[PDB]
Amino acid sequence: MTLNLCVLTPNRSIWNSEVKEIILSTNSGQIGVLPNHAPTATAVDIGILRIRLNDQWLTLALMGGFARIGNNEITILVNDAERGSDIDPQEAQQTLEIAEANLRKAEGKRQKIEANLALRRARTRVEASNT
Amino acid sequence: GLTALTMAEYFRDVNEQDVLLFIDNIFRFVQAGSEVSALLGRMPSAVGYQPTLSTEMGSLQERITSTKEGSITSIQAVYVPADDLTDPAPATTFAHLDATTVLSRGLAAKGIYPAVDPLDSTSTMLQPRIVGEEHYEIAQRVKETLQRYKELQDIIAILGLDELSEEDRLTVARARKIERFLSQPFFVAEVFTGSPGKYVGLAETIRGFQLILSGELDSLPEQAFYLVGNIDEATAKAMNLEMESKL
Amino acid sequence: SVKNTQKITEAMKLVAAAKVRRAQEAVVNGRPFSETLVEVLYNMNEQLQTEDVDVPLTKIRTVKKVALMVVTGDRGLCGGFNNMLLKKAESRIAELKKLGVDYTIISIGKKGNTYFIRRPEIPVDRYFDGTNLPTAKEAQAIADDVFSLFVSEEVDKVEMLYTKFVSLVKSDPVIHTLLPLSPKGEICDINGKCVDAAEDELFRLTTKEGKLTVERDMIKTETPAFSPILEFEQDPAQILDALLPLYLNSQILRALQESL
Amino acid sequence: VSRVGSAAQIKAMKKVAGKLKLELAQFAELEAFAQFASDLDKATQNQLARGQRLRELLKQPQSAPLTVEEQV
User: Fold this and answer.
1) What role is this protein assigned (chain B)?
2) Cα distances (Å, whole numbers) of residue A98 to A105, C9, C137
């Protein structure tokens, strides 16, 4: 009734557990997943990889990555993933305002993509408000 | 010392039997020589032992000789002052000793009785023309194995017994087996623990160490060699442990 | 004093061996991710045979301005390590001052960057540090920095100076060109020893007759071509566009773990 | 060292001071890793911390007599 989810990370295996529903957000859309999904390949980018296991809709904030979603065995190549409640509300929101202090700095194309990645850190920060 | 020496020399040259002198630490004998020479006023020598130090200690330890009647082999504790082989009293003593076996405190605390250290102990008899070619080979191989284990005691803490290479995992296993097999129960320890006590001939321990180090007994457990006599008795211990393994 | 020094240096030898083993354990933790990444990348290269108009991280069309990024070891007494590293760095920046490249330097070592902050004759800017384990957040910081540097084409042919772990006595410092990334998957060298990926090198340290030495493992992961049907969610381009960043990050984290 | 050894101690000391001597020996062996214990193996860390606490068991005030019923 579940898929062998193994979300990876360059030095870890963040959430190695089986999940009913997978709501990883790609570039185009937040493609929901049920068991026995068809073999595809999603470029999961910024966005919470919300997962609805039998317990709850436990959220995990991933920064960036990619997901080769086969059949019942999904393996996701996340850059940085924070499962469950590893991140906490107050510090996350304050660092989100720090990210806003970052975004408006300067310097054309060279640093505005760094400001974009700081905005994506703020997107990681919005996850701690959801719990 | 000389009293014990003549009391043993009568045994030697009257009953033609092997005598053992357990002269307690020679440094007390040399100390007493220094005391009596400083009392006689004879001008002291180097560091402060008597001038007739070599002559006196040689007169004590030259009547320790295997005469045609019988051997009078002695066993002399030696206590180095300030732990140096350099000063005259341990120098003039180690000029005479023919086999030096140290009893190691850490090994004694471990419980590998007898506590005699297998590595740091040495003897001038160990050479092949004296012992036997196979005895020299197996003794040098056991000393190299225990050297390997004294080295890898550093690393088996970090890497573990499995991570390191399995060509010397055999070395570590046989090293544990040797370090245990060296422990022998005594005919004297019966009053303390209750083990009967086994006398192990030279041939028996030679063949046992050859079987342990050659590679046959790589399957017997490590605690089957601890406090056992002949190697077949160690196999008997292991077979009894195998009998009780099911229960 | 000499006896206490002997005890202390024996303790530091033991602690350094345990730290080497824990860094190897972090690399073996990472090897699932690297294997899955180096097989999915081939799966993409097989579904599309480099049919692409994408990935600004593949602008190798000139060698205008190189960013040699030199990671170094960051402690005291540093074996004979930091001097060798920054020596090869100085030789390479001299050769890049010949061609007229205007090289910038991203330094990752604390001792290395404190050295670089003395002499600015070498243009060195934006130096960071991470030690005792390369954390994925520091790897993300370095990835974001050099990534934002490559999206603006001012930074090109962005090679790195990490010392691959060939042996325990001395490991020669090698230099890898990073940011082109060769979307075929090959993260190759300084043009004369380029290597294919999915043929990795994972160091496993094991004892010899008696000593401690590192024995290389040139293990080969076999890459599954594609699942039977293999439908495709995103565009043919955006997949590699979003996948090459994390591959860059994995190579940076590997050249930080093996450098450490 | 003491030549008599544990033949002098009472049975309570014979049971407890054995572990005390063993743990102080191990802590003196690990006295080189006193500060350099950097997130090492938990056996090493726990043993070193217990040894560091054991030496402050050892130290005691001036002219303070510990009757055996307390020191055991």
Assistant:
1) Produces ATP from ADP in the presence of a proton gradient across the membrane. The catalytic sites are hosted primarily by the beta subunits.
2) 12, 44, 17
